[PDB]
């Protein structure tokens, strides 16, 4: 009974045609991944930082150890080409199966094969499909482990000497560490899982997740839902869609905060400095300039009575002054050599700041993730000249929007699944209007 | 007779004068906490060092504010995005100085409002209604999340979230314009179109229905008495109203399907307000309004100002003046 504008709901019980939509659409994802990589490659200029060039995919590939050497310098562009071509080529195969199953294949599958066919209300079959996909996902997270440990390693921005690709030989398995992150507060100085700051913990976390997904998958193939779960949920295609939309929404919001605060699995060498980083780098920059002129940056009192360059955080740590007081939780490889136990060390600041650190601060301060929609870089009052918007701003804003709408989609499809399952999604029966059989409130 | 099942029956009862429900079990205490703390702080809280520079701003009535100037002041920039509950302060005195009440109120309120939205879903299901009123409410709800939580997360400090006050609100919107050029941002433009259009269509719809009321009354009685609550017949004449509006414009620009019409009414402002909430949420990560500063120059290279460059002079005066003691270095990067 659906109109053209709700026309894909006509597919709910056409498992064959619905398989074709899912696989054709899978092909578009892979097509975009491929085409877009080649586009970025054809535009890439290695003399320029990735983040001055509008790249979002090449940074993901380089983060994995391909194409780069010490300091994040690109040494070999061929790995990027391969990733693009292979994704591009593979989308024709998904395209092919997609349109074959949407147009020509059997439109329902359950007559052709009891293994591939399914009924949404069939809880055993549904958890079996779920189980298979849980195993696939566990395999995938183990591929990341394999890369890091057996096929060249990962880019490590924290590596000594400017960052480098490093093979991960001792992934963290200690569950007090791995699950410690799940239980950290999401507030400042804590950061829930966004604070993971070293690749040992990244890889070990993926060993755990792979084993959990494979175990979870086998668990769901072998079992059916317990009665308490049977009575908690709505068991319908649209209900399952609504569950996953909610889960995508949660994940989109997390990805937003990851690319905005995390500079370990989103290295600033490729993605540009974070907001906190850039702002810390401004104070560093002018600390250096001023100290070189003779200023005693530790004893300089600013207009407010707080230190012009250096102050204490609320728990006492020595931190940068000015508005960046708010970003003192920031940690980065260019800054950590100056940190002592009480926070920034005044004797290291006076004696041990290196030219590469001065360069890096200047670079990050002048590439802060601020820019206009037409890609004029810098604060909103800046004149035209610099064509820059940080990849982190692009990746944060896009995924906030998508996460928001998928939460709207969750509420849409969840409320509708509840209503359709109870039998009043099309409206109130005039002859059995529930409120007319209820007593008045007053 | 089971105790838990009786309590379940009361929580979800459709006979309670106000529906409680499972979403209400969380909403009731969180909103009471946020309301009680808000009222106490608006009347009696002492000055709060919003910007972390030991320059406290007085928000409450007893400390020399009126209704227009008063505010619960955001938490200290020294705190940033750190969680600052009462029990993390050495004393209430400290917690008040540093803006603790703002955190308590906005976290409790955002939770309670989230549950308000779910409560809207829930009672619709107990009454056998269709479910999407809550989807309409997600537009205002997303807007409060944007100015109380999202924008702070991206800028790094609850001190840049929206004060809970009338003049505080205006301060937030002037500074937003200087730091993001929100007016030149298309998602705020859709928000204005959502809100202007919503008011337009509110008036239109109200005036067209009012215009076609069926004479049921005398000139000595309010026409409102021509409709009796729960009567089955429509009370106006949609065909006469369609025939008036189709002629004011032209026929195919007028609705005669009342379902399409009211869906249009729902969707236009809701979608416009989604976009403007998304505008704030994405200017949280500094993807700002269009910049046409010095975009027109002449054959020699002279700048030829436009109305955008004049906007920029205004933005500059906001920029250079705001938080006038708080910046030591030449770029306001957050």
């Amino acid at each position: 009974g659906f109109a053209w504008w709700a026309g894909n709901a006509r597919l709910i019980n056409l498992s064959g045609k619905l398989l074709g939509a899912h696989v054709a659409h899978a092909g578009l994802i892979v097509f975009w991944a491929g085409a877009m990589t080649l586009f970025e490659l054809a535009h890439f200029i290695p003399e320029k930082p990735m983040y001055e060039q509008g790249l979002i995919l090449i940074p993901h590939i380089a983060t994995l150890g391909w194409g780069v050497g010490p300091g994040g310098e690109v040494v070999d562009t061929f790995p990027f080409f391969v990733v693009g071509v292979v994704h591009l080529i593979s989308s024709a195969v998904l395209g092919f199966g997609g349109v074959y199953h949407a147009i020509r294949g059997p439109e329902t599958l359950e007559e052709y094969s009891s293994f591939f066919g399914y009924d949404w209300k069939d809880k055993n079959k549904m958890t079996t499909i779920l189980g298979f996909h849980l195993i696939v996902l566990g395999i995938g997270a183990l591929l990341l482990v394999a890369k890091a440990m057996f096929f060249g390693g990962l880019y490590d921005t924290w590596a000594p000497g400017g960052g480098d690709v490093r093979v991960i030989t001792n992934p963290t398995l200690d569950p007090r560490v791995i699950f410690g992150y799940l239980l950290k507060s999401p507030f400042g100085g804590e950061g829930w899982i966004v604070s993971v700051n070293n690749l040992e913990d990244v890889v070990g976390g993926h060993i755990w997740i792979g084993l959990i997904c494979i175990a979870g998958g086998i668990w769901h193939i072998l079992t059916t839902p317990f009665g308490w779960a049977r009575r908690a949920f709505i068991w319908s295609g649209e209900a399952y869609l609504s569950y996953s939309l909610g889960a995508l929404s949660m994940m989109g919001f997390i990805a937003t905060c990851f690319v905005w605060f995390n500079n370990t699995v989103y290295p600033s060498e490729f993605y540009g400095p974070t907001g906190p980083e850039a702002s810390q780098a401004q104070a560093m920059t002018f600390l250096i300039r001023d100290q070189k002129l003779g200023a005693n940056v530790g004893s300089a009192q600013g207009p407010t009575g707080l230190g012009k360059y250096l102050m204490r955080s609320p728990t006492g740590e020595i931190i940068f002054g000015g508005e960046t007081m708010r970003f003192w939780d920031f940690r980065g490889p260019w800054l950590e050599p100056l940190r002592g136990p009480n926070g920034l060390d005044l004797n290291k600041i006076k004696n041990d700041i290196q030219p590469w650190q001065e360069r890096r601060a200047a670079e990050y301060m002048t590439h802060a993730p601020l820019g206009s929609l037409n890609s004029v870089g810098g604060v909103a009052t800046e004149i035209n000249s610099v064509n820059f918007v940080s990849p982190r701003s692009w990746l944060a804003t896009s995924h906030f929007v998508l996460a928001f709408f998928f939460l709207v989609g969750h509420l849409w499809h969840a409320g509708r699944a509840r209503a359709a399952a109870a039998g009043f999604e099309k409206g109130i029966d005039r002859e059995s209007e529930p409120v007319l059989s209820m007593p008045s409130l007053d | 007779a089971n105790l838990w099942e009786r309590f379940c029956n009361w929580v979800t009862s459709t006979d309670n004068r106000l529906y409680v429900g499972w979403f209400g079990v969380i909403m009731i205490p969180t909103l009471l906490a946020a309301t009680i703390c808000f009222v106490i702080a608006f009347i009696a809280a002492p000055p709060v060092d919003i910007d972390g520079i030991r320059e406290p701003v007085s928000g409450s009535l007893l400390y020399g504010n009126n209704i227009i100037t008063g505010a619960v002041v955001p938490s200290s920039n020294a705190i940033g995005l750190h969680f600052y509950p009462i029990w993390e302060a050495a004393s209430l005195d400290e917690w008040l100085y540093n803006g603790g009440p703002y955190q308590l109120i906005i976290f409790h309120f955002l939770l309670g409002a989230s549950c308000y939205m779910g409560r809207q879903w829930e009672l619709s299901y107990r009454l056998g209604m269709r479910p999407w009123i809550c989807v309409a409410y997600s537009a205002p709800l997303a807007s409060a999340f944007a100015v109380f939580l999202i924008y702070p997360i991206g800028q790094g400090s609850f001190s840049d979230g929206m004060p809970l006050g009338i003049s505080g609100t205006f301060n937030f919107m002037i500074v937003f314009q200087a730091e993001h050029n929100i007016l030149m941002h298309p998602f705020h433009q859709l928000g204005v179109a959502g809100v202007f259009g919503g008011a337009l269509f509110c008036a239109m719809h109200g005036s067209l229905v009012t215009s076609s009321l069926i004479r049921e009354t005398t000139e000595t009685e309010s026409a409102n008495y021509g409709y009796k609550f729960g009567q089955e017949e429509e009370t106006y004449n949609i065909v006469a109203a369609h025939g008036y509006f189709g002629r004011l414009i032209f026929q195919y620009a007028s609705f005669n399907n009342s379902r399409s019409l009211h869906f249009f009414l729902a969707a236009w402002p809701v979608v416009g307000v989604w976009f403007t909430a998304l505008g704030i949420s994405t200017m949280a990560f500094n993807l700002n309004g269009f910049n046409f500063n010095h975009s027109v120059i002449d054959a020699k290279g002279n700048v030829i100002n436009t109305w955008a460059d004049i906007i920029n002079r205004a933005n500059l005066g906001m920029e250079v003046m705001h938080e006038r003691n708080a910046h030591n270095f030449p770029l306001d990067l957050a």
Binding site: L436, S440, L441, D442 | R17, L18, I43, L61, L62, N66, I67, K228, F229, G230, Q231
Partner: peptide, 30 residues
């Protein structure tokens, strides 16, 4: 005196809410 006035008005609005809700004219059908 102005603080007392502001709070007094706000308090009357809250009391009105209570009567508006619990002591409304009950809507009656047909």
């Amino acid at each position: 005196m102005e603080t007392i006035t502001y709070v007094f008005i706000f308090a009357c609005i809250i009391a009105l809410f209570f009567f508006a809700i619990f002591f409304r004219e009950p809507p009656r059908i047909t």
